[PDB]
Amino acid sequence: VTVAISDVVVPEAKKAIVKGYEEQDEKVQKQYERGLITKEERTQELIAIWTKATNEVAEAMNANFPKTNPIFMMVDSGARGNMMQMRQIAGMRGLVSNAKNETIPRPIKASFREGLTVLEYFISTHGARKGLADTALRTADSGY
Amino acid sequence: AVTSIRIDGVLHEFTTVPGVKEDVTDLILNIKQLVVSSEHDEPVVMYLR
Amino acid sequence: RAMADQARTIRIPVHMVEVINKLARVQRQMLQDLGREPTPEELAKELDMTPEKVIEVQKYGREPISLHTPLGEDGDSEFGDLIEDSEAVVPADAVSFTLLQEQLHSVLDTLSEREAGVVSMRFGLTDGQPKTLDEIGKVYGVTRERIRQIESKTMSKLRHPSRSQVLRDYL
Amino acid sequence: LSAASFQETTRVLTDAAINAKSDSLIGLKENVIIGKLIPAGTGLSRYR
Amino acid sequence: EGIINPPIDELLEATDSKYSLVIYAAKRARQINAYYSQLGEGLLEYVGPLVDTHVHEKPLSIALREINAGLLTSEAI
Amino acid sequence: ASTAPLRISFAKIKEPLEVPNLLALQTESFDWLLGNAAWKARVEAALESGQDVPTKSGLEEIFEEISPIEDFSGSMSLTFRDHRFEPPKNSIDECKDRDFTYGAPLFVTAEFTNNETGEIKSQTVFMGDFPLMTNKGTFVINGTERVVVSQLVRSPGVYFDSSIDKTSDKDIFSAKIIPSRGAWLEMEIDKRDLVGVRIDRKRKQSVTVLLKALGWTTEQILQEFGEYESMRATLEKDHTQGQDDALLDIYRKLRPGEPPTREAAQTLLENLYFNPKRYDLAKVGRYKVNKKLGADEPLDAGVLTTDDVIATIKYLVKLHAGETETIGENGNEIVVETDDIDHFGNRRLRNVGELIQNQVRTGLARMERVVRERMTTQDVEAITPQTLINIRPVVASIKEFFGTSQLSQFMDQNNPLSGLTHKRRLSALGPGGLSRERAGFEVRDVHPSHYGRMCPIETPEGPNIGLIGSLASYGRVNAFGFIETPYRKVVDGQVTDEVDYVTADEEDRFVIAQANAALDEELRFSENRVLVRKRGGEVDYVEPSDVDYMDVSPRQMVSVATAMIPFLEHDDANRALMGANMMRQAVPLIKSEAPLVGTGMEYRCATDAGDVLKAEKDGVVQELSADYITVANDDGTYITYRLHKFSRSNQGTSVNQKVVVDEGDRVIEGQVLADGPATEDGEMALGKNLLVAFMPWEGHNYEDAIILSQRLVQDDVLSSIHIEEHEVDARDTKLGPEEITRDIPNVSEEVLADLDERGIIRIGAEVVAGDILVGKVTPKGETELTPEERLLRAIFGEKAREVRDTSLKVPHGEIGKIIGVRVFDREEGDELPPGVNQLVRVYVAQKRKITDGDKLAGRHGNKGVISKILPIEDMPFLEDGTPVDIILNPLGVPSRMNPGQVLEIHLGWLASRGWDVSGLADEWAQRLQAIGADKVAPGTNVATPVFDGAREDELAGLLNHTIPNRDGERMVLPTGKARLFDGRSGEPFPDPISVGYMYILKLHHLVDDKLHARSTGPYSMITQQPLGGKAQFGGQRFGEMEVWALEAYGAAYALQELLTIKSDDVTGRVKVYEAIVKGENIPEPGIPESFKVLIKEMQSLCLNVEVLSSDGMSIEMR
Amino acid sequence: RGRPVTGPGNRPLKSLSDMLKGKQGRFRQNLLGKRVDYSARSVIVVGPQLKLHQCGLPKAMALELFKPFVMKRLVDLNHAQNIKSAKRMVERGRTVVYDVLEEVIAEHPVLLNRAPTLHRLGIQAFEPQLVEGKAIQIHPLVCTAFNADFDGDQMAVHLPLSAEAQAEARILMLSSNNILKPADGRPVTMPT
Amino acid sequence: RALKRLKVVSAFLQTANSPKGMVLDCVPVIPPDLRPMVQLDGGRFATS
Amino acid sequence: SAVGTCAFCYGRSLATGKLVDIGEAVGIIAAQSIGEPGTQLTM
C-alpha cells in the first residue's frame, strides 16, 4: 500500500456528466435572464441540478476504483478514512455554503487532484473557518 | 579519520579566525569530508600552515 | 500630618517623609531644568548629604506590589503563585539532619562513659544547654582544668584518621 | 459543602449559615475535600 | 513474567472481588515489610514470607504469590 | 533584482505589477508620524499618483490641535509650532548592547504672547526623547526589539441595523452614531412604532422630546415628519409641550436629583455633543457620515450638528417605513439600507503612527492642563515658556505605551519569515478593540470583502481563530485607515495597463473578473463566459461587456507566508492553514539550503524581511572576511559592512550571517552581500531536501510518527546551534554589599578551576549541570547553630566565615560551551538601576543534532515526532544503492485531503534528476518550450507559483524524459513509483513504492525543553502545594477530571495519597521521605493544609464553621 | 454594593469573598485538584516492541522520580556509606546508579495520564523500563484509549508510593485488564 | 410573599441562630501568614 | 433498595463484562460516558 498521484484516479465519465449539467445550468440562466423565473426559482433549480450532478459523479467514482487500489484498500478495510473524503479528493467537491449559512448555487466542479481555481478556494475557506471555530467552542461546551 | 583539532587563536567552535572567510564551525564541516588513511594505532598528528 | 501617617503600608515617620519629598522635588526640578536624569553625586551635592543617604532615601519611598497582579495573557495565575517559599522544611534536609543526629549518637557511644558524658554536657546534646567547665568538674568532682583536658582529648579522638570518615560526609 | 464547591458559593453559604445546616460527609466530593477515603471502591468498611 | 504474574483470574478465585483483593494483598504486604524492617530487633508477631523469594523482591509480589498459592486466610472483624 | 539565483519557473501568466515593499505598512506610517524627508517626498510625489492627500505630519497636527492655549480670561496665550528632531545619541548596536531605548530628542518652538504691550517670548523647549523605528520596522526598547502591530477597529460613523423578534414577529430598527473620543447616541424604533431616542444608553426617551428641546415646534414636526405614521403616533403620545419643558424633562431624566434649570440642560447637552473639547469624530467619521447621509459638510473639523440628527432621524424612519432610495442633503440621492458591521467598508486599520499619536495626545492633554493651571495660579511678567511646560506626562505616556501594552509585542525572531509575518499582522483585539471571550461567531468569519485585503488561510488555530490575520500580498492601507487593493482596468472588453486601487465600497460598486482568464492575446477575453464577482460577493458567469475590472494576478488574496506553499490549490484549507502557521516555527540550521521545488516568493521575502545584507551603492568588493566586507564605491567613497556572528535572537536561536561575494567581484546596489539566519544565497531556506518514500515500516511510523536515516545525524543535516544567557547581579543588603569573587566559603578546589581572576567562568570552558558560572558571596550575620553542627565544627575545627554562597550555576539538564561574558560595574559609569552594584551575563551555546522526540514537518500541514533513527544499511534503498532519508506513512495523505505533498515529491524528484525535452512535438511539451523550461541540468531549482503552478500533464510527461543515471536506466517508473529493496531481509518489496524529494522543516518543539520531572522541590507560600511550572521543579497538576477517573476505577487509597501526602500534608511529606529512605511502611496521611486555610477564611467571614466528632464535640484542628 | 475599590493600575482589590468563589477560588483550584510530587511529564513516541503492560521511561525522568528508592538501594549494597554520600552520588550521575535504578524500577507500576481525561481509561498503570532518550514510549494499542497521537502530544507520569496505592494500580488500573469500553462495552484496545 | 418570608422567619424560630448575628460589633482578623508580606529580592515587598 | 441502588437492578458492568461490584461508582461512570462524545456532536 502506497500513495502516488497516479493512484488517485478521477472517473473518466465525470466530463460528460459535468458538461450535460453545465448545459442545463446555462439553459436555466438564459431562462432567468429573459424574465420567465424569479431569483429564488433559479437558485433552487440550480441547487437541485448540481446536487444531482454531484450524486452521479460520486456513483461513477465509487464504481470506478479497482478493488486493489491503495486508497480503496485503505477505505474498504476500515483502517482509515471514509467515502466523503475520497469523493472530495477524486471526484466533485460539490456545493458550499456562503459566509451566511446558505448554499451557493455554483458548485466546485474540480477535485483536489485537478486543483481548484482562486474563487473556488476562496469559497471553501468559508466553511473551513466555520468548522474550525465550532471545533474550538465544542470543547468548552462539552466540558461544562 | 580525523578526531580533533586546535587552532592557534581559537578557543571554541563558535568563533571565527581573523583573516579567513569561514567560521570555525564551517572549517569543521570542511575537514569532515577529508579522506585519510593511517597505519599507526596511536593518535597521529599532522600540521597545516 | 494625617497623610504622612496613613498613606503607606510600611509607615515612615514625618521627618523621613519630609526628606523623601524634598529629595523627589529636587530630583524633579533638576530633571526639568537640566534635561537629563541627575546622577547621585549631583543630588548629593545639591541636597547637601552623602550619596549613601540619597540611595537610602530613594530605597525607602518605594511602594509594595501585590501578589494578585495577573501576569499571563489568559489569566490562569497570579504574581504570587511563583514566589518560592524559602523558609519551609525541605524533607531531604530534615532527613539528612536526623541521620546526622543518629550517626553522632552512635559514634559518641563508642567512647567511654565519662568522655561521652562530658562531651554531651559540654555541647548540651541532651538538653541544648551549654555548661561551663566548673559545673562539669563539680558533677565529676574534679578540677576545672582537668575537665578542659578531657574535652580536648575526646575532640582530638573524633578528629582522627580512624574515626573521622564516618562523620566527614555530614560536614 | 458539595453545593458550595459546585457554584453559587456566596448564596449557598449565606443560606446554609442562616439555616445552620450540618454536613454529614456521605458523598464523594466532601471526603475528597477533607482528605479521607471516599465511600466507594476500596474505601468501603466492608473491605477494610 | 513481571507485573502480570500471577494472573488476575487465578487470584480472584481466592476472594470475592477486586476491591477486597486489593486490601487483602496490601495488608499482607505491610505485614511482610514490617517483618523485614524489624527482623533484626526483638521478635514480633509478624511472620513470613511463606514462599521462596528473590534478592530484593517487592513485598506486594510476595503477598500476591502467597495469596495465589493458598497460604493465607481473610476473616471479618 | 537581476542578481537573483537561478530558478526555472513553470508560470504561464505574465504579471503586470510587482509585489509592493512588504515592510511599507510600518515604515510609511512612522514616516508620516515623524514628518521625515521621505514622507515629504511622498506627499510632493502625489502629482496625480496615490492617495497621499494629508499634508500634515502627525506631530504637527497634534501641536496645531493643542494650540492656542489661553486662560479663562484670555489675557495671555501659548502656542507650539515648528517641531524639530536632533540626531540620535546612540546607535542601534550600542542601544542593544547597553540596554538603552533607541530614540532622538524632540524640540518645539514655543512662544508666549501677552496681550498687554504685544509680547513674544519664542524659545526652544525639549519635549523628551522620542523612540525611533529602525529601517526594519522595529523598535529597540530597553535593549529588546519590539514590534507594534496594527489594529482592526470599527470606524466611527452612523450605522443602521434591523433585528427580528421570534416572539412578537415584528422587526425592530436601530441607528447608532458612534464617534471616536465621544459619547454615543442611539435611536430605535420598537414593535410599538415608537421612535426611542436612547441617549448615552440612559433609559429610553421619545425622539419628540429631544426634537422639542432642539428648538422644533409640534407644527414643524407634523408638517415635516408627517407622511410616516410612526412619528405621528409618537407625537400624539407625548402629553408635553414647550422647549423649556422638554429640555428640563430631558435633564431630569438623564441627570436626576440636581436642581433643574434651563441653562444647566442646554450647557450639559452642548458639552456632551457640541463641545469639540470632549467630543470629536475624526476625519474618517466625518467622511463616513457625509457619504452615508450625503451632507457635504467640510472635513476640516467634525462635531455633531443638529442637521445630522434630523438627517439620521429621517434615514431611520424612511428605512423603517420600507423605502429603498431617498433624496439627500447636498447630493443627488442615496440608497436606504442597513449596514454590515463586518464589511471592510466599516472596519478600519489603526497603524503604528495613529496609536503613537493617540498616546502623545493623551499625554499632551495633561501637560496643557498643568500649563494652564500653573499659568493662572502663579504671577505674571516673570513667566516664560520654559517654566510653564512640564514634559513629565508626555514621556510617562510614551513609556507606558511602549511597555505593558498589548499592541507593543516582544518581537518574534525564529527566522526571517516569522519576523516578516509578525509585521503585516492585523489584530482585532487590544485596547479599544474587543475581547477574546466576547467575540462571536460572526466576527471570525471570512467575509467576502476580505478578497485582496486580508488572508483567509493564515490565522491562529487556538481560541484566537479569526481575531488575528495577515495583510494580503498586494494590500495597501488607505489615508483613512481602510485597505485598498489593485485592479487592472478593462474597457470595452480590452484589458488595458491602467491599475486602479479600489476599496471595499468601490469593489461592491463594480464587477470584478478573475485573474487567470484565457485571452486571445490581443488584450481581449476569449470564452465570452467569464466567472466574475458581483455586488454581494456572489460569483456568476457574465459576458465580456459588463466586466470593468480584472485581478492584477492570481495569488492576490493569499498572504506572504501562504504564497510559499507549492501546490496550494491541491491542499484542503485546514491543512494549508496549519502549514502556514507551522512554517513560522522552523529553526535556522547551521547549513542552509534553498528548496528544490519552491514558489517564486522566496527571494523577495528573504530580501524584504531585512535580514539579508544588501549593497547600498554599486562598487567592487575591496576586502572580505567572515567578519566584514569593505567595498570601494564608484563615487570614490569606501564603506565597510559588519556581519553578526553567533548572536542570539529573542527565541534563543542563533543569528549568523555568511558571505556570498568574493574579493574580485563587482556589486551593484541592491545586490545581496551576506546571507541571513535562514537564507541561502539570498532566498528563504527554512529546511532541507530529503529523499522520502511513502510506506508503512514495521510500525515505527505508526499514527503520524516519522522514521529517519542515520545520515541526517552523520552530516549534521538537521543540526542547529542554540544559545542561552544567564544573568546575575551583586546588589546591596542590610548587612553590607554582596561581592563577586572566587573565594567561595566551602567548596572543593576542583570546582574553582575554570574561574578566572575575578570569579567569572572562562570563555571556552564547557559547563555541565551544577557547575559554577559566577562566584558570589552574601553576608548573613550572627546566627546560632544547632548543637550537632557546633560539635561537628569543633571536631573538624572549621571556623565559620559568616558569609554564605549564592553563586550562579547552570540549571539542571543544561550543557554547552561558554561564548561570551559581559560584565557591568556601577562604579565604572554604567547606568545600572539603583541598588545594583554589579551585573554579569554569561552566554552558553550548544549544537543540537536531530534525535527521536524532535518534531519535524512539511509545508502542507504534515507534522510528526521522530520515533526512530535507523542505521544507513537497514533503510529501503533504490535499485542503485541509494538509501531513503525519511519514511512517511501514506495512510495520513488521503483522509487529510492534502494531495499537494505527493505532487511536491514528484516534482522534486523531477527537478533533482533533470530532463531534456526539446524535439518533442507533443501537446504538453509545447507549453514547456514557450516558457524556457526545455532543458534543465540536474539539481536545478524550479518554481511553481501558488495558483499557476505545473499541471499534472507536464509532470507525467516529464517523468518519462529524465536524464538516465550512470547505469543508463531511469529508476522511477512513469507512474511515479520506484522499486525498492528491503534493508534488513534483503528481498525486494513486492510492489513499486512512491519516492521523491520533500522539503522538511525542523520545528521549534524540541524534546530537550519539554522533559521535566520532580520528586521534591520548592513549595508555595500561602498554601503548601508544589510550585507549578518549570523554572522551578514543579509538580504536574492533578485536576478534577483525573480525580473523577480515579473515583471511577474505585481506587481510594491512590487518590487519598495523591491529595494529602504529595501536595498538602506538611508534616507528612517529610515523614514519607524518611520512611522511604529508611525502608519501612509509608505512614498514614493527615489532614491537608488547604482545608485549614479554607476554614480560617470562612471564620474570617464571620461564619461559625466547626468540625464535630462522633459526639457533638469540636476538634478545633490544633 | 457600589463601585469596587482599586489599587495601583486601577484594578479591583481582592476581598475575603473573592477567595472562595469562581474557577480560581479555594474550592475549585486548591481543594478539588492540586499539584503533586513524584510526577513527571514528557512527549510520547511509539514503541512497537513493547508489551501491552509495558512503558518506556527516559532514564533521566526515571532517575529523578525514584531518587529516594535508588539512594536507599545503593546504600544497602554498600555502593555508599550513608544517605549523604548516596545523594551526592546520585546527583553527580555516576554509572552504577543507573544499574541500581534498573532493578529498583522493576515491578513498580506507574500511572500514565493524558489531559484531557474524558473517561477513566485516560489513566492507566504500566510497568516501566528504561529507554535511551528524552521521550516516553507508548504501546501502539493504548493510543485509542488515550486518544493520543504522535504529532507532538505529551503525557504525565505519576508514581504510587504505598502498598495500597501500588495494589490498586496493579490490580484495578493495569493496562492489559481494560480492553472494553465503559460507555457501551466494545473493545478499544484493538488494532486500529 | 408570606410563604417566601416564612422560610427565613422560621429558620431563626427553631434553630440556635439568632437575628442579632446579622449586625457586627467586632470583626475577626485572619492570621498574618494567610496574608503574607513577603520580601522579594531587591527590597521590593509584596502584599496580599 | 433502601440505600442507594443494588447490583441486580443495575445489571452487568459494561467495562468488565460481569455483574457490577458492591462499591462501584456508577454515577461518575454514567456522567463520563455521556459527556465524552460531546466533542463529536457537531453543533
Ligand SMILES: [Mg+2]
Ligand atoms: Mg496529537
